[PDB]
């Protein structure tokens, strides 16, 4: 179980030995323009 | 006419943090600014909550003119006297009473809703509606707090991948959705400081 609050989230990019958050796709791997990876 | 539905147009919105120098000198700090690609809206489902009113609901219901997804990139670069707001302003042809509802989510799962009632004011053939200095909440300044402490960009921009934040902004009377925005963010690096695109949300 994973857990949502702010410490954990700030945490498990910290120390990613422990983060213990939901996996989720990164927006670079998703189907989205090139617009919203590249600022005007 | 960007963020606009049929009903609604947002000209203006900003987070800020402004501090007091001195009783006459104020200095003011953008972390984020507004003053059309489309996205395949089930790309970011995922990311904000579901269920009754949630984003789906919400697109199902429509107008689908209403929907729209903003990408900042905020701009982090700055220093008892401290106020954290948010500004908007919106025009509409409409005389209504309008609620501007804004969730901060983590996960795609809300973590605090800050709502605002607004009335209309006459301006020039048109109905101005505006928030002016709202308060933004505490979890955001800590998690503003927490994001400069960090000391790797990209640890920030990983953290950020996972916070959103939608705002539904309806006739209070009749629930019509006006406008439904969705914001990602990155970190800004540019020299140019914050930047946005602004897309609109479609079925696919
Ligand atoms: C608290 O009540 C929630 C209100 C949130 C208002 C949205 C303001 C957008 C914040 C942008 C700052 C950039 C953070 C990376």
Redesign the pocket.
Same mark, same amino acid.
């Given at each position: 179980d994973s857990e949502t609050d702010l410490e954990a989230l700030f945490n498990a990019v910290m120390n990613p030995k422990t983060a213990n958050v939901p996996q989720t796709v990164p927006m670079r791997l998703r189907k989205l323009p090139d617009s919203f990876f590249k600022p005007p | 006419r960007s963020v606009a539905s049929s009903k609604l147009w947002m000209l203006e919105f900003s &987070?800020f943090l402004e501090q007091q120098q001195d009783p006459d000198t104020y200095n003011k700090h953008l $972390?984020?600014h507004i003053g059309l690609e489309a996205v395949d809206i089930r790309q970011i489902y995922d990311k904000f909550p579901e269920k009754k009113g949630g984003l789906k609901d919400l697109f199902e219901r429509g107008p689908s003119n209403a929907f729209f997804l903003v990408k #900042?990139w &905020?701009d982090?670069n700055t220093n008892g006297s401290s106020f954290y707001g948010?500004s908007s302003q919106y025009e509409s042809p409409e005389n209504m009473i309008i609620t501007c509802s804004?969730k901060?989510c983590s996960f795609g799962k809300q973590v605090?809703?800050?709502v605002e009632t607004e009335y209309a004011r006459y301006e020039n053939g048109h109905y101005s509606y505006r928030i002016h200095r709202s308060p933004?909440?505490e979890?955001?300044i800590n #998690?503003?707090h927490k994001?400069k402490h960090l000391p790797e960009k990209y640890m920030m921009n990983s953290v950020?991948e996972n $916070?959103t934040?939608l705002q539904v902004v309806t006739n209070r009377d009749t629930q019509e959705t006006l406008l439904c925005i969705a914001?990602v $963010?990155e970190v800004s690096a540019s020299e140019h400081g914050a930047q946005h695109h602004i897309f609109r949300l479609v079925k696919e």
């Open positions: - | &987070a $972390f984020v #900042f &905020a982090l948010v804004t901060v605090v809703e800050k933004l909440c979890y955001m #998690f503003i994001l950020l $916070f934040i914001y $963010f």
